[model samples]
Target: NYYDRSVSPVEYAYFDQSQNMRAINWNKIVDEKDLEVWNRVTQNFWLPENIPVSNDLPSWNELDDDWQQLITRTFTGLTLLDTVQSSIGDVAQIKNSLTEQEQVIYANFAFMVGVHARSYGTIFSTLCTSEQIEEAHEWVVDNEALQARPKALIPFYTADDPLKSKIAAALMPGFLLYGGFYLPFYLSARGKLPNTSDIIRLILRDKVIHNFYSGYKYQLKVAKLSPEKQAEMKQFVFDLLDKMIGLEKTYLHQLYDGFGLADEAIRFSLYNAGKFLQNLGYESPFTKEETRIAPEVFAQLSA
Candidate 1:
């Protein structure tokens, strides 16, 4: 697609920062390795309908209301966030000012978000009655805690900033939602409801690579910023995680107070927050010793 022989693919910048809208030069890629990695990785995509989530269907009634409520509230939180992520997070950034290759990768990114949203619905269909599903939806709709991060992120995705900054900025909260919260929640639920937990575990596997690819791009963008700007961004990252901690504590206490899970849940949240920071190549924002799970719970999960 190189219409102009003057610019070679290797010579081209990986990210186009020229702010030129009308240039139809070849869609040649500078980051061919990234392109190849994503292309290969995306080929094995799966849809939620075909996944074997129905295996958990019959077991749903066996659990007590406390356990069921945990499943309900947590999945509600997940569904709301995944909905926003599909509609507003990465999709917005990829809609403009990206090279053809970048667009292709991010198209898969958006598709995967959609896949995850559908997966949550599939989980609900298997695990909840119609009335329960309706109640879950209604309950989550008014959840200020579930809605907070997305509301804070609206301007980050909607702004007229360059695609690079937006991608990096979005990764901040995006990683916290997926990697920090969802992954650990999935982990904690493993033994409690192994069947449904396995489904989320599979999804979490995909999210690990997904967040890593996002953080890879984000790291590159951060490297390009000035030291002062980088420090400011780090401060913002810590501040956002701090807010998320407060919100998560309040939300979990509401759903889990009588079940003796509030302490462990908050610890898992801290664990994931630290892991999210580490994944983005930072030292822990909180100590791992404080956030690590209890031995018996982790052993139960492993078993």
Candidate 2:
């Protein structure tokens, strides 16, 4: 009660990068208004869960280890990576609108938050609430398959052992990599980009934090494990890259349909994924830095 009372109705006004309102650049050609709208659309991106076309009937509890552990971990990684991806894409877009110094300040702050969210996810899955665990058990006992959002299936991440990572890998795909990014591309193409800018701005801010912290958590977890455990993480990535690519292809295809995204845009998204991998030092789609990955990342590749 006291906490809410102290800051209940905060009020602040933000304008473009100028003190004098009259002097602000209302560039007719660049269209910051269109950008703002695009930002908003991305900000409000919360997709419902998506189920596969078909699945063999199986009791959830009786499901095999690969179904339970492997699939679960992989799904978790996918969602997490997707979530981070959407977040980063949104942020990068917004930063493009900012002044130079503002971009630096904004990036520093946004990245801090992204790391926090990623770490929070780690702590959360490992230490799920009683209600959440109960729900998981109920689903398993009832012979239900755990499905994720379609957006949860973005394929930026390859999985390590879920037990070590707390199902984080599952979240990597849909949430990080496939969270409705295509809309931005299509909208921006036809000169309607400003409509969704607000939400995009928020997601961008959140993602900077997600990618940094997620990698940091991986590094910490890897450091605590033995070489065998590290190798296990390594093998997981090597084998899972095929799955990762498949997911990425699915997402890109969905976004592009008959048309296609520019190759450079795809490369930039992959580049960010790699840097994050380099941060954790786990094998990723981009693994040239395996040698340079510090103990933080080095140990995870041992397996």
Candidate 3:
């Protein structure tokens, strides 16, 4: 052995096992699950005891489509942890776009958001009808208790010092990416700060699109969904958004962190991110053209 730190040939039995776990088409279950959940939970949103109404509030179903998509996606519980993990690897080649400090902070935050994505999926268990939900859970469950999870996507941040070129790092880039759609939303709501209602609206809309494309369509592609089941899937994206706007005032008041920035400033950050995504061929989710229509939403969400 030439002791020059050379690597040796290796073998892994598990590589063959992964072939069995090859990309799954889980779209049908996701659609069926979300359809049941969204329909049930949303019915009581305005029961007087749950939330009050005001004359100045926009009517339900009045929100911009992109905003609604953002909210729905947040709730439907798609864990993009794998995406973030893989993206970190792909993004490393262009690492300078974010600063060392931001890399650390964003890493932690990415994991935190992953927690939310994972947790939100379980809510369907509570929201759906029992039998259908049982069927849905077989696929929806993250099953981490007995499964091996992907390696820590956001590697540990062991910064050596406190002052490391803070000004040169991300000025709000990561924040905007996670929350880019809120800008148009903050605007459509008339420069007013967002409340829980507002953020929920945005996430809900996102859920519809994300579920159909990422969850449902994926399942259909694998021949897992039936013709009748696929046809039952509805595009209620715009209607979902309308429900969000009517509750924005209530929602915004509850949201403490819009990228953790003040109302107007958060709007600006969102706008900038939206533009950035567009330069790279992505659009703001809040814009109707982005999430409401089947074309781009299909491509972007699936891609």
Candidate 4:
């Protein structure tokens, strides 16, 4: 049990039957993969303030009110999830960590996710009025479809099995947030809000690493379980993912309905879902055609 320090600590000694705490030795590694993830996270460290989001103001002004509302609302949704991941989700991962190095990496991951949550506020402050920002927050509070993903996943973070928590953590950045991410990329494809999209791009880059590292950790742990247990875990993952996909489609329709982008947004989400499954070392539930995003949107994503 992780609660038992005797089991969880990296290095502990009983001198004369008394426990002696030892400092973590970075050189004596349990898993080299933890150091690799740590180095990658440190190398990619960034802050929202580093991006000049003000440059998007002129572009924001150019957008029709409907478009502006859509973007703001979408970002508020993203912010909600990022906040949850940073504050609650990653904390659970840290608690469940098997090694000191992995715990340190999760600490870094939590901080970066906090940065991502704050980046939305930076975008809002730069491009929106106080009243508009307030309205967006209120909308986030009341949006049922937007709330569904967290409702379904948050319980897993504190589940009895730590592996379930890891699965939920991986799913957040891996698949669930992509629906919100699609709007910015979609706008950028049309030569709109390039600067705002740039900030989102940075967040996306971090999430790419987050997804992989978290999923890799999950794989390592799950591999130690019985084959029957592994199958059970896989079933849980797919069932949960299916539910999240349905919720994402509903949320996308709420955001993109009548704007003609809902279908594309849903498809983009499926593409991320495919990646999410791949990160978890499973084949995608989606077919090739089902996961295909628009060519221009893919170009914007690549750019």
Candidate 5:
């Protein structure tokens, strides 16, 4: 499933990576489980137009000055985060993918990423003025972490040698942004009643499932690498995670203070970072049992 070739010699095979040179062969199932996951995501897809943020208007309008500012800044950070992931990570993953099956899945996943990015605007419009949204965009451009994140990951995506390692390494940022960074915020805001962040919660569910898909593909790519290269990959993850956590803390400090927000977010980032390692078939290095977000913040995201 990793490499872009046929393992066995046969006229027609059960799984052929190159069967559809430039198109997906829906009739042919490369992996039924993979197909199933894509199918479920497709059926569960939601557009921002269908989700209402106006209902959150009252709660947003009633918030204290500090709370309002914090919410605006934090959500704007998330919006820009998704924008980068959708544009750089998901788009490149589709192109970097060796198999038609993987490409097809990421293609759809990219569209969902677009939905989540745009949905941030959906909530913002309700809680903020047009001027505020514009200011938020400017803030994102100047944000230190936002600028450095893609730069740090660009080398991996652009690397030419050892195609599998490069492709797998490119996936690291998306996992961190979605699972490690955004997951904690969504978990933090769950059931908090403004309903604005619940949209993030919805998007977070999609991201978690997609991270699983990414992990599955990543392990397949890693399996083809030498043990030495594999060790390098682990070190690569550590370095990336450290950079990202530091970046996230800088942003969190600028957005909120004095409420354990920055501390919990970093802890949650580490937790999800550990979870990302586990997703790649390794034991979690950070053995913390403490909850990342509040315990009661968990609930079922519905259809």
Candidate 6:
């Protein structure tokens, strides 16, 4: 019953009763936007191995114990979210994709998410001992705020609703990780960990694309619904953003408040929070003043 050719391929399930599995014909894309995203994502391909994370050794030695602790905890927290995105988020998106080209794009995006996740380990291994690495992994396992987003999202990714999955996926790259991301850029602005921050900058660039594409796909799907239904979906997005932003503030405070970085980090997150809403085709819940990051940190992020 699911194999009705009368319906567009965009609505097809991953497995249908069709006699043959349809091969993807790149020349006949159902959505030209998919091809454009594919081209852009492919053009941005990179691996962490090319970055010299080990070059930060001297800087690592110069850090006080508190500074070292902060960076380690932040990276581990980020590693968990990146692990969720590459492992569950993209897989769910690929399964839920409306077009073959979009599936291919998610596949490429998934691989890069894996690269980003691995890059964290590259930084850790280069800067910390094996014992320290083990402790960091343990800390991630035990941190409630760090674990909260994935816990909240796993059910959505595994659910049957494609729209829900895309919403959850958008949140990951759009705003959830920006708090942790601020740390590296902040440190780099102060002339520490330049090489490691270079890797994070690459990851940030990829995440921006990922967030926008996810939101665009969500908009396409949601537009097909009734106006009332679209409004309801928008409310759901706002509510979820509010919940996640609370958790993100708690997580940021846990990581940076003692070091006086929490306020700036939260502002950085709020800045991306506005971007996340914009990507989902909504106005920001924040005022322009509330979303401003420090100019020095912004410069590092831009660089």
- How close is every model to the real structure, measured as TM-score? 0.79, 0.38, 0.25, 0.93, 0.80, 0.94
Estimate, for each residue in 1-303, the C-alpha lDDT of model 4 and write its tens digit: 222343334334211223444456687787888888889889998888888988887878889878888888888889999999999998778767767788788888889999999999988888887877888889999988888889999998867778889989999999888887888988888888898888888898889999998999889888999999999999999988888888888988987877988888888889999999999999986887887888888987877
* 2 or 6, greater by TM-score: 6
Q: Write the per-residue lDDT of candidate 6 for residues 1-303, one digit (tens) a residue.
A: 332243334344555534434567786667888888888888988888899888898988889877887888888888889989998889778867777788778988888999999998888878887877777789889988878878988888998888878999999999999998888898888889999989998998899999999999999999999999999999999998898998888878877767888888888999999999999999987977787887889998888
Question: How many clashes would you count in candidate 4?
Answer: 0
Runs in model 3 deviating more than 4 A are: 1-77, 80-98, 129-131, 137-276, 279-303
Estimate the overall C-alpha local distance difference test score of candidate 5: 0.61
By TM-score, the better pick of 2 and 3 is 2
lDDT of 3 by residue, 1-303 (tens): 221222111111211232222121233332354444334434422211122223213432455544333333333313343244224422231222112222232333334334334433433332334554444345325433211112211221122211111110111122222333343343334532223333334343433332232222223332444656433322222232233232332233233233342354334333443433333222346553322322322232223
lDDT of each: 0.61, 0.37, 0.31, 0.85, 0.61, 0.85
Deviation from native of the Cα of residue 49 in model 3, angstroms: 19
Regions of model 4 farther than 4 Å from truth: 1-20
Better of 5 and 6 by lDDT: 6
- Candidate 2's C-alpha runs over 4 A off are 1-191, 262-265, 283-303
- In model 3, where is the ten-residue run with the lowest total lDDT? 161-170
Query: Which pairs in model 6 have colliding backbones?
Result: none
Clashes of 1: 0
**What TM-score does structure 1 among the candidates reach?**
0.79
Q: Which one is best on TM-score?
A: 6
Q: What is the lDDT of residue 160 in candidate 1?
A: 68
